[PDB]
Scaffold this active site. Structure first.
Site, PDB file in Angstrom:
ATOM      1  N   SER A   1      -9.193   1.346   1.968  1.00  0.00           N
ATOM      2  CA  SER A   1      -8.352   2.368   1.407  1.00  0.00           C
ATOM      3  C   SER A   1      -7.196   1.551   0.752  1.00  0.00           C
ATOM      4  CB  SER A   1      -7.897   3.405   2.434  1.00  0.00           C
ATOM      5  OG  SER A   1      -7.133   2.873   3.491  1.00  0.00           O
ATOM      6  N   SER A   2      -7.136   0.231   1.039  1.00  0.00           N
ATOM      7  CA  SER A   2      -6.114  -0.688   0.494  1.00  0.00           C
ATOM      8  C   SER A   2      -6.615  -1.321  -0.792  1.00  0.00           C
ATOM      9  CB  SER A   2      -5.734  -1.833   1.465  1.00  0.00           C
ATOM     10  OG  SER A   2      -5.388  -1.381   2.752  1.00  0.00           O
TER      11      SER A   2
ATOM     12  N   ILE B   1      -8.127   1.520   9.590  1.00  0.00           N
ATOM     13  CA  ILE B   1      -8.589   2.291  10.753  1.00  0.00           C
ATOM     14  C   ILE B   1     -10.129   2.203  10.909  1.00  0.00           C
ATOM     15  CG2 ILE B   1      -9.151   4.640   9.888  1.00  0.00           C
ATOM     16  CD1 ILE B   1      -7.265   5.773  12.169  1.00  0.00           C
ATOM     17  N   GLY B   2     -10.826   1.987   9.790  1.00  0.00           N
ATOM     18  CA  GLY B   2     -12.268   1.731   9.799  1.00  0.00           C
ATOM     19  C   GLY B   2     -12.756   0.534   8.988  1.00  0.00           C
ATOM     20  N   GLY B   3     -11.813  -0.251   8.446  1.00  0.00           N
ATOM     21  CA  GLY B   3     -12.089  -1.423   7.591  1.00  0.00           C
ATOM     22  C   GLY B   3     -11.208  -1.543   6.350  1.00  0.00           C
ATOM     23  N   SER B   4     -10.165  -0.714   6.266  1.00  0.00           N
ATOM     24  CA  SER B   4      -9.395  -0.548   5.028  1.00  0.00           C
ATOM     25  C   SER B   4      -8.515  -1.709   4.554  1.00  0.00           C
ATOM     26  CB  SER B   4      -8.563   0.708   5.132  1.00  0.00           C
ATOM     27  OG  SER B   4      -9.422   1.840   5.084  1.00  0.00           O
TER      28      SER B   4
ATOM     29  N   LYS C   1       0.854  -1.180   0.000  1.00  0.00           N
ATOM     30  CA  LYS C   1       0.000   0.000   0.000  1.00  0.00           C
ATOM     31  C   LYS C   1       0.908   1.253   0.000  1.00  0.00           C
ATOM     32  CE  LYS C   1      -4.037   1.830   2.650  1.00  0.00           C
ATOM     33  NZ  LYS C   1      -4.831   1.460   3.841  1.00  0.00           N
TER      34      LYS C   1
HETATM   35  C1  OL1 Z   1      -9.502   2.624   6.278  1.00  0.00           C
HETATM   36  O1  OL1 Z   1      -9.800   1.767   7.394  1.00  0.00           O
HETATM   37  C2  OL1 Z   1     -10.611   3.650   6.132  1.00  0.00           C
HETATM   38  C3  OL1 Z   1     -11.958   2.993   5.886  1.00  0.00           C
HETATM   39  C4  OL1 Z   1     -13.071   4.024   5.691  1.00  0.00           C
HETATM   40  C5  OL1 Z   1     -13.576   4.456   7.059  1.00  0.00           C
HETATM   41  C6  OL1 Z   1     -14.456   5.694   6.997  1.00  0.00           C
HETATM   42  C7  OL1 Z   1     -15.118   5.848   8.380  1.00  0.00           C
HETATM   43  C8  OL1 Z   1     -15.900   7.131   8.600  1.00  0.00           C
HETATM   44  C9  OL1 Z   1     -16.150   8.029   7.558  1.00  0.00           C
HETATM   45  C10 OL1 Z   1     -16.869   9.198   7.806  1.00  0.00           C
HETATM   46  C11 OL1 Z   1     -17.348   9.470   9.082  1.00  0.00           C
HETATM   47  C12 OL1 Z   1     -17.106   8.579  10.128  1.00  0.00           C
HETATM   48  C13 OL1 Z   1     -16.381   7.411   9.889  1.00  0.00           C
HETATM   49  C14 OL1 Z   1      -8.153   3.336   6.553  1.00  0.00           C
HETATM   50  N1  OL1 Z   1      -6.963   2.760   6.607  1.00  0.00           N
HETATM   51  C15 OL1 Z   1      -6.053   3.686   6.890  1.00  0.00           C
HETATM   52  C16 OL1 Z   1      -6.666   4.854   7.043  1.00  0.00           C
HETATM   53  C17 OL1 Z   1      -6.102   6.115   7.335  1.00  0.00           C
HETATM   54  C18 OL1 Z   1      -6.850   7.303   7.143  1.00  0.00           C
HETATM   55  C19 OL1 Z   1      -6.239   8.536   7.432  1.00  0.00           C
HETATM   56  C20 OL1 Z   1      -4.917   8.555   7.906  1.00  0.00           C
HETATM   57  C21 OL1 Z   1      -4.236   7.342   8.071  1.00  0.00           C
HETATM   58  N2  OL1 Z   1      -4.822   6.179   7.801  1.00  0.00           N
HETATM   59  O2  OL1 Z   1      -8.005   4.643   6.820  1.00  0.00           O
END
Ligand code: OL1
Ligand code: OL1
Ligand code: CL
Lengths: 545, 546
Positions: free
Chosen positions: B185-186, B206-209, B110
């Site tokens: 995001s991956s 961080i949220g499912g990426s 990534k």
């Molecule tokens: C990845 O897990 C992000 C997945 C999308 C999560 C969105 C959640 C959300 C959106 C709007 C409102 C509330 C919640 C991911 N992997 C790495 C990262 C990251 C982001 C920023 C900096 C570093 N790493 O996100």
């Protein structure tokens, strides 16, 4: 209105009095039945040997328990270190698991280690008469390892202090000299273990609260990496502050005792009871190693001028380590002023003190906290104006004051990131010199009562490693000589501010008091840290095998 | 002014073009010299077998490297998953440590995994032409274990998205269906590994990426406990947000590959290069255990209604586990709305988005982020007024909006403490039922391009475990049937808000697409988690080769 605070004090004193009375009765009843027990033989046995005799059957748990209960009661008379007799504990005695690594060992607890049916007041009126409803995790593990926790020991009001007085149970004194502080916030443990009244205890430490009382009272203490052990169920007064992390750890008469204690805690019972702790078992091979060490060292942090006794302690230890084959390398963590003033103070007081101050609504403010509360209460603009006035004459005072102001979440993020970068920066330093461990001074000897609250700068030796979150322990290596004490009259400090002036005065009149050095390793290297502590113990106090 | 953003896009596209052109030349040169290499035999080998043959000498590292480079370049043509060819990597090939656990294995990264001499743009203008000065720690470890990192793969602008487009390198597409998101995001990794172009990769989550792209592209992913692996040297865009921690972890075509990758990473090299990571070695005994398991499960989180494909995937896995001797216990973590709306959203945006928005100053905002940036930019009072207005009608939208506001250090302490208590609450719930592991649904089939940004609610299944910081992995268990797809036309959702409406439309036309379930264990139980993932893989994809 102080009626509520006075009521709480009256009650707390009643319970402490009743507890000590219960202890006396139990001790006398036991002694009448065991007139020929050699109590001093038993009391002077090192924990390792005590444990082995408990395990063989040569000593009964009752003999060990009641002998130690008697000594705890006796030493409390001149120290006021005990707040409560943990009332279950004789029934626990009878059911202690036989194969447990701490079978039959009485263990003292700093008052904030929650214990079912007992208050964890921290000296605050608002926590009085609010008994804990279960044992915290590490108390459960001790008990599952056959240990018998038996007293809660005293702490300074709120625990945010390296003295040991509160308006509820009053003031704990140093067992070596009544006019001196036992240190703290784990001062009860320091006083109790230091005078022979418990073979092993647990304390906590966010700015030096295991290490101060260990140093001041002439015993050993280890502050592990914050998340090596479980803080589940611990009583505290500020919640969700993660920049500078609490740590909990053992206090005892020797290094082997701390090692045994960690080995007993770092078991499956802890790891399953609290899955948030990484299940890192005690690495005996690393603790028992006799490899030569690359030992970094500094004789001063250029923040708190060390006392003559501190400096001599450090150099003599340096020298015996050199003599034993270790490599001693000058090493000073970078940007100490910034770690203390911006990162540590800011992390501890990001909200300007407001959460902390809620604890004192309605309450008396113990004299041993000094003006901390008065200062935190000041509005942010006034802390700021004061800071700008003090900056040219007293930059240190100015710095703390400025960093004790409230801020946004956005700024706390920025602070948390700087803590993380600082941590990696010292790690980088450390790797560049290829250190195994680090030898530093430890604040010593004990300050007079009610002076730690006025010598805040003196936390520089210990708080640095809360900020870095490295394992740090202290070992007694010498006692203050007349020559050391006379030389205090020439101590000026690096700043000449009120903190330096008070520290000069506070460390006087200390002939015969114990003085420690501090041992540091990298995060998660508690075993190596203890291995190093064991080496210092051996070279400096050969008689403690 | 977008003159700077346009300049950065023009340059990044030149670099990507040049990279791919260098890859082609290297592949063509190799193929000329090795006309009789069975590249399909080699490509279709599972990683464990590939590793063994590299190790015996039966396959040369060059054979493996160039065959894989050729496939990567091919699949990129229809996916736009590769942003850069890691230019050192042939020299590293020649010097890869022979006794290394990943000796000769090409590994995709990534783009945020810093690599000396390369940008980690994250699709943001402000990071273009700022090449990394050294390899991040996990890249160093990979290399010390004999691996050969060879491509940076694409990510959505800023990484804060479960789609995969940015203004610099553009849009990555799903290899199964080019109108579908690869997730993310991956997403680059998901698309690359998913079409055969890399046998092993690392992502972040961080949220499912890690889990979205794995699920959407039909592959495996593990999000470990946050601090199981070193984040040192990783590129990010928000600094000092510790309430909801990032985690890094492997992606691959099977569970055994994830196990090996964790085993290779959890060595003394990682532990001494980043002392902040607890030195917990990979526990093989736990990983290889075949004891019956107490498996908690739910078919729905009552937050995002699962698609018919998701629900069937979940029940069929439940059923095969029961058939195999495991105990299936109904279990739903308590207070999920709170964990998502208050704890997760608040922890992620405690400052109202201000630090995050710094990254977008002067930049284009990729369509695939939807209105996220527009909403964060809104003043706090207006987020609040808007929230009270929406509350009666769309309480979910209201909740997120309210929890996306700035606050004091004081309130963040309260929040961090709430996260810590919620964590202990679920742990207690889990211990009360004496679970070993937990089986949940996993979002999918892949949503259409540019729709994840408008279906924020659908992170519920994955973000819960970022908030709890439990290890969570995903395994493909089925593909969408005609019948599954027909039944989406009856999908209503639990709220009927714009997020449910878009999800319905976004999962349409998905016959044949892969669908996963999700596996969870307690903190630090990555080995148990993988053991459970292995079991689902064995029961639901029996024809998955050794
Ligand atoms: C990845 O897990 C992000 C997945 C999308 C999560 C969105 C959640 C959300 C959106 C709007 C409102 C509330 C919640 C991911 N992997 C790495 C990262 C990251 C982001 C920023 C900096 C570093 N790493 O996100
Ligand atoms: C103990 O380490 C406290 C030692 C005294 C440190 C004072 C530091 C300071 C810094 C800047 C300005 C003023 C004072 C200790 N042990 C436990 C705790 C504790 C406190 C609060 C909540 C939980 N635990 O402190
Ligand atoms: Cl941790």
């Amino acid at each position: 209105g102080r009626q509520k605070a006075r009521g709480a004090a009256t009650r707390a004193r009643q319970k402490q009095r009743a507890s000590l009375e219960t202890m006396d009765k139990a001790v006398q009843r036991f002694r009448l039945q065991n007139p020929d027990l050699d109590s001093e033989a038993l009391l002077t046995l090192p924990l390792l040997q005590l444990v082995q005799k408990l395990q063989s059957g040569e000593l009964s748990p009752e003999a060990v328990f009641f002998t130690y209960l008697g000594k705890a009661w006796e030493v409390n008379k001149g120290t006021n270190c005990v707040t409560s007799y943990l009332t279950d504990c004789e029934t626990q005695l009878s059911q202690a698991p036989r194969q447990g690594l701490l079978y039959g060992v009485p263990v003292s607890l700093k008052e904030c280690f929650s214990y079912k049916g007992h208050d964890s007041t921290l000296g605050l009126s608002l926590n009085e008469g609010m008994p804990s409803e279960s044992d915290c995790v590490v108390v459960q593990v001790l008990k599952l390892q056959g240990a018998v926790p038996f007293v809660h020991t005293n702490v300074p009001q709120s625990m945010f202090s390296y003295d040991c007085s509160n308006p509820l149970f009053g003031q704990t004194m140093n067992p070596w000299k009544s006019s001196k502080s036992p240190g703290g916030s784990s001062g009860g443990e320091g006083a109790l273990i230091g005078s022979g009244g418990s073979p092993l205890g647990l304390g906590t430490d966010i700015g030096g609260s295991i290490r101060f009382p260990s140093a001041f009272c002439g015993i050993c203490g280890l502050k592990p990496t914050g998340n090596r052990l479980s803080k589940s169920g611990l009583k505290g007064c500020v919640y969700g502050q993660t920049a500078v992390q609490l740590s909990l750890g053992p206090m005892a008469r020797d290094v082997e005792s701390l090692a045994l204690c960690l080995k007993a805690l770092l078991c499956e019972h802890l790891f399953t009871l609290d899955p948030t702790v990484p299940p890192l078992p005690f690495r005996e091979e690393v603790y028992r190693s006799s490899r030569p060490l690359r030992v970094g060292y500094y004789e001063t942090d250029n923040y708190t001028m060390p006392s003559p006794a501190m400096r001599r302690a450090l150099i003599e230890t340096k020298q015996r380590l050199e003599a034993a084959g270790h490599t001693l390398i000058p090493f000073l963590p970078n940007n100490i002023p910034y770690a203390l003033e911006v990162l540590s103070t800011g992390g501890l007081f990001s909200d300007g003190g407001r959460s902390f101050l809620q604890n004192f609504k309605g309450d008396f403010v113990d004299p041993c906290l000094g003006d901390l509360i008065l200062i935190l209460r000041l509005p942010s603009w006034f802390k700021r104006l004061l800071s700008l006035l003090l900056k040219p004459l007293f930059p240190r005072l100015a710095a703390f004051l400025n960093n004790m102001r409230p801020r946004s979440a956005e700024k706390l993020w920025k602070l948390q990131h700087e803590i993380e970068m600082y941590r990696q920066s010292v790690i980088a330093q450390w790797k560049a010199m290829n250190l195994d461990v680090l030898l530093t001074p430890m604040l010593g000897p004990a300050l007079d009562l009610n002076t730690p609250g006025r010598a805040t700068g003196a936390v520089s030796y210990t708080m640095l490693y809360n900020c870095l979150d490295f394992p740090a322990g202290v070992v007694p290596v010498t006692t203050v000589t007349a020559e050391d004490d006379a030389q205090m009259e020439l101590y000026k400090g690096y700043f000449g501010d009120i903190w330096d002036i008070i520290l000069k005065k506070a460390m006087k009149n200390s002939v015969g008091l114990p003085v420690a050095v501090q041992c540091v390793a990298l995060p998660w290297q508690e075993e190596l840290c203890l291995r190093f502590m064991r080496e210092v113990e051996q070279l400096m106090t050969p008689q403690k095998q």
